[PDB]
Design an enzyme around this catalytic site. Structure first.
Site, short mmCIF file in Angstrom:
data_model
loop_
_atom_site.label_atom_id
_atom_site.label_comp_id
_atom_site.label_asym_id
_atom_site.label_seq_id
_atom_site.Cartn_x
_atom_site.Cartn_y
_atom_site.Cartn_z
N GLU A 136 0.84 -1.24 0.00
CA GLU A 136 0.00 0.00 0.00
C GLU A 136 0.86 1.26 0.00
O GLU A 136 1.01 1.91 1.04
CB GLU A 136 -0.96 0.00 1.20
CG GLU A 136 -2.14 -0.93 0.97
CD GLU A 136 -3.24 -0.81 2.00
OE1 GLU A 136 -3.08 0.00 2.95
OE2 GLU A 136 -4.28 -1.52 1.89
N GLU A 225 -5.98 -7.58 -0.62
CA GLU A 225 -6.29 -7.40 0.81
C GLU A 225 -7.68 -6.74 0.92
O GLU A 225 -7.93 -5.69 0.30
CB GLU A 225 -5.24 -6.51 1.48
CG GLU A 225 -5.39 -6.48 3.01
CD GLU A 225 -4.35 -5.56 3.60
OE1 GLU A 225 -3.14 -5.87 3.48
OE2 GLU A 225 -4.71 -4.49 4.17
O1 LIG Z 1 -5.97 -1.20 9.22
C1 LIG Z 1 -6.31 -2.52 8.73
C2 LIG Z 1 -5.29 -2.96 7.65
C3 LIG Z 1 -3.84 -2.95 8.10
O2 LIG Z 1 -3.69 -3.87 9.21
C4 LIG Z 1 -3.63 -3.23 10.47
O3 LIG Z 1 -2.33 -2.67 10.57
C5 LIG Z 1 -2.17 -1.95 11.83
C6 LIG Z 1 -0.86 -1.24 11.71
O4 LIG Z 1 0.20 -2.18 11.45
C7 LIG Z 1 -2.25 -2.99 12.98
O5 LIG Z 1 -2.11 -2.31 14.24
C8 LIG Z 1 -3.62 -3.66 12.90
O6 LIG Z 1 -3.70 -4.66 13.93
C9 LIG Z 1 -3.80 -4.29 11.53
O7 LIG Z 1 -5.13 -4.84 11.38
C10 LIG Z 1 -2.93 -3.45 6.96
O8 LIG Z 1 -1.60 -3.60 7.36
C11 LIG Z 1 -2.95 -2.42 5.83
O9 LIG Z 1 -2.49 -2.96 4.58
C12 LIG Z 1 -4.30 -1.77 5.70
N1 LIG Z 1 -4.65 -0.83 4.83
C13 LIG Z 1 -5.97 -0.46 5.06
C14 LIG Z 1 -6.39 -1.19 6.12
N2 LIG Z 1 -5.35 -2.01 6.51
#
Ligand SMILES: OC[C@@H]1[C@@H](O[C@@H]2O[C@H](CO)[C@@H](O)[C@H](O)[C@H]2O)[C@H](O)[C@@H](O)c2nccn21
Length: 300
Positions: A136, A225
């Site tokens: 991302e 994702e």
């Molecule tokens: O926030 C939800 C997810 C995110 O995971 C989130 O990352 C956060 C930061 O590392 C963690 O604290 C969360 O536990 C995890 O669910 C993905 O790493 C990202 O690719 C994304 N982009 C949009 C949403 N998300």
């Protein structure tokens, strides 16, 4: 069975197809960060997902920052474990260079090139592997034309020197939502797809229309994702909007991986705290999100 049957994947007319040229749709799970929840990524849990949920792809989310690979590169061996398990289980596997806080993929481009050289040298003669070179990209200062496309035009040649044609998924701007700009300025490699990500807590109608715009330019899209939660990974589950997206992806035949396989106390997590890291989960050990995702893959 899955990889023996479909074999070598490629892109034809903007669609993921098998070695006979027939459309194929992958549905599976993403790990959470391998630096935090790697205990859930092993042959036995992956076999349970294959046999009980029906997954045909598994995504190994190797964070670069946040205590991930740049800080402690030992996590690359967990990626290798996941790839080898997918080979042994005859399913596809996504190797995800999981940028996020390191919001420009150029920040760690030298390390990315070396990592993808190693992975493509090791695994480039298996049909299972799909390379996801930058989860991302994000930030208003990170654009497709100025930052992401040129990054891809450095990493893709590294991979292609070892692996001429397995699929490469390339992240898009604005947290892999800006498929419009990528679709108007596509990469040359014929076996590239662009990432599109969604979280069902966001009202999605215009985002679906933008995916359709990209498809109409002949760009192939992989939903590498998505979550049932809000964009934070938490905030409750939004199953009505998730089902709208599931149906949309089936109609457009879009492959996907769900975030994420962990017991962390957040709504997008598929498991509850007593779930065994080697599989065999009961219904009570799946979260509301996990129950729904499992049903979606079993129905398929
Ligand atoms: O926030 C939800 C997810 C995110 O995971 C989130 O990352 C956060 C930061 O590392 C963690 O604290 C969360 O536990 C995890 O669910 C993905 O790493 C990202 O690719 C994304 N982009 C949009 C949403 N998300």
């Amino acid at each position: 069975s899955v990889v023996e049957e479909h074999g070598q994947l490629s892109i034809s007319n903007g669609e993921l197809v098998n070695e006979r040229g027939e459309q194929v749709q992958l549905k599976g799970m993403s790990s959470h960060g391998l630096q935090w929840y790697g205990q859930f990524v092993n042959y036995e849990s992956m076999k349970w997902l294959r046999d009980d949920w029906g997954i045909n792809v598994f995504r190994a989310a190797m964070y670069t920052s946040s205590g991930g690979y740049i800080d402690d590169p030992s996590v690359k061996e967990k990626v290798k474990e996941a790839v080898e398990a997918a080979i042994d289980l005859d399913i596809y596997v996504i190797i995800d260079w999981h940028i996020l806080s390191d919001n420009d993929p150029n920040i760690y481009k030298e390390e990315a090139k070396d990592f993808f050289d190693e992975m493509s040298e090791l695994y480039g003669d298996y049909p299972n592997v799909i390379y996801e070179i930058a989860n991302e990209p994000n930030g208003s200062d990170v654009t497709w034309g100025n930052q992401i496309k040129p990054y891809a035009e450095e990493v893709i040649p590294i991979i292609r020197n070892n692996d001429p044609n397995n699929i490469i998924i390339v992240g898009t701007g604005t947290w892999s939502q800006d498929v419009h700009h990528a679709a108007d300025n596509q990469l040359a490699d014929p076996n590239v797809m662009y990432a599109f990500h969604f979280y069902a807590g966001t009202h999605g109608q215009n985002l679906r229309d933008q995916v359709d715009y990209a498809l109409d330019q002949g760009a192939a899209i992989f939903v590498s994702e998505w979550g049932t939660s809000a964009a934070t990974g938490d905030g409750g589950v939004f199953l009505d909007e998730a089902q709208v997206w599931i149906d949309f992806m089936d109609e457009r035949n879009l492959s996907w991986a769900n975030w994420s396989l962990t017991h962390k106390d957040e709504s997008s997590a598929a498991l509850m705290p007593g779930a065994n890291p080697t599989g065999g989960w009961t219904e009570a050990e799946l979260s509301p999100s996990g129950t729904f995702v499992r049903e979606k893959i079993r129905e398929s």
